[PDB]
């Protein structure tokens, strides 16, 4: 089973008063893409059944109990995730790509896109922002959702954001422009970095790309939460996705959870799977519904 990852007690060291905020980042893998476009040559097709992956994703959410849920590649929002998660208290909003590649697949379930769930009993929605990312006025196919939430017990406001940049190789400059557009939007929505901000998303980029450099050196004072897992707390994890395609076995770190370095403490982080644990055929499989591992962290304000 995949339920073998541990939460590492982390950096805060403060006794801090308020209850933690669970934030989950995950590329749940689209069903249309997993069947048509994705080239999982080692994964059985019976493991890729929709009714099967549907339950595993639900079991993943039930296991970690997130207060906030950021998702990429959701092509079954209205079919599955919205009515079920609302029955568990989650308020959610959906924003599909204008030209999703899922439509290229024969028996597709419509467009895929970002999704943002949050416990309605824990947070009050302040403002919405469906952002179509642009590269110097050029409307891109990619999409982001920014929202301000108020803690009903504290009154502390903060912003969460979910995105999914341009995928393949040869789009580094394109992704870099996409990231800059999102940064400019978040700088406006957070009222000039006056309110804390958390950014989840499949950036489709290694830490070496310029898009990562822009986020790491942004004036929003952001930091990658999963870096704290490393020995120095300065290194991005060795992977966030691991799969074998027609091209070959692929192991990349593309998922991130950015946060206000000055206003947010990372209480914990769900550690990764070892090679012996993930199995030889890698992700996905009978025991995991996606080629991406979910990122889960506990956040907390600095007082
Ligand atoms: Mg994918």
Curated annotation (Swiss-Prot):
A cellular component annotation (GO) from this entry: P-body
Tissue spec. comment: Adipose tissue. Expression is higher in subcutaneous adipose tissue as compared to visceral adipose tissue.
Binding-site residues, substrate: 73, 97-99, 141, 164-167, 202-204, 292
Keyword annotations: Biological rhythms, Cytoplasm, Hydrolase, Magnesium, Metal-binding, Mitochondrion, Nucleus, Repressor, RNA-binding, Transit peptide
Any GO BP: circadian regulation of gene expression
GO molecular function: 3'-5'-RNA exonuclease activity; metal ion binding; mRNA binding; NADP phosphatase activity; NADPH phosphatase activity; poly(A)-specific ribonuclease activity
Binding site for Mg(2+): 73
Catalyses which reaction(s): NADP(+) + H2O = phosphate + NAD(+); NADPH + H2O = phosphate + NADH
Subcellular location as annotated: Cytoplasm; Nucleus; Cytoplasm, Perinuclear region; Mitochondrion
EC numbers on record: 3.1.3.108
The protein's enzyme class: hydrolase
Cofactor binding comment, as recorded: Binds 2 magnesium ions, but the ions are only loosely bound to the protein.
Known cofactor(s): Mg(2+)
Keyword Magnesium appears in the UniProt entry: yes
Region (Interaction with PPARG): 221-231
Subunit and interaction comment: Interacts with PPARG.
Free-text function comment from the UniProt entry: Phosphatase which catalyzes the conversion of NADP(+) to NAD(+) and of NADPH to NADH. Shows a small preference for NADPH over NADP(+). Represses translation and promotes degradation of target mRNA molecules. Plays an important role in post-transcriptional regulation of metabolic genes under circadian control. Exerts a rhythmic post-transcriptional control of genes necessary for metabolic functions including nutrient absorption, glucose/insulin sensitivity, lipid metabolism, adipogenesis, inflammation and osteogenesis.
Family: Belongs to the CCR4/nocturin family.
Protein name: Nocturnin
Protein species of origin: Homo sapiens (Human)
Residues included from the entire protein: 123 to 425 of 431
């Amino acid at each position: 089973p995949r339920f073998q990852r541990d939460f590492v007690d982390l950096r805060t060291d403060c006794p801090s008063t308020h209850p933690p905020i669970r934030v989950m980042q995950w590329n749940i893998l689209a069903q249309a893409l997993g069947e048509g476009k994705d080239n999982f040559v080692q994964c059985p097709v019976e493991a890729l059944k929709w009714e099967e992956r549907k339950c595993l994703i639900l079991e993943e959410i039930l296991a970690y109990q997130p207060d906030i849920l950021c998702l990429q590649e959701v092509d079954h929002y209205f079919d599955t995730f919205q009515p079920l998660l609302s029955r568990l208290g989650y308020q959610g909003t959906f924003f599909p790509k204008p030209w999703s590649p899922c439509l290229d697949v024969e028996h597709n379930n419509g467009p895929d896109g970002c999704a943002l769930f949050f416990l309605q009993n824990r947070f009050k929605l302040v403002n919405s922002a469906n952002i179509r990312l642009t590269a110097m006025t050029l409307k891109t196919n990619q999409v982001a959702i920014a929202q301000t939430l108020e803690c009903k017990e504290s009154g502390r406001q903060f912003c969460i954001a979910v995105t999914h940049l341009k995928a393949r190789t040869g789009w580094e400059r394109f992704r870099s422009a996409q990231g800059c557009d999102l940064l400019q939007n978040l700088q406006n929505i957070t009222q000039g970095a006056k309110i804390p901000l958390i950014v989840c998303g499949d950036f489709n980029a290694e830490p070496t790309e310029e898009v990562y450099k822009h986020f790491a050196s942004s004036s929003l004072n952001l930091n990658s939460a999963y870096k704290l897992l490393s020995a120095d707390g300065q290194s991005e994890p060795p992977y966030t996705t691991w799969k074998i395609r027609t091209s070959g076995e692929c192991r990349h770190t593309l998922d991130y959870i950015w946060y206000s370095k000055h206003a947010l403490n990372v209480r914990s982080a769900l550690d990764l799977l070892t090679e012996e644990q993930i199995g030889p055929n890698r992700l996905p499989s009978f025991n995991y519904p996606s080629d991406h591992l979910s990122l889960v962290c506990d956040f907390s304000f600095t007082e």
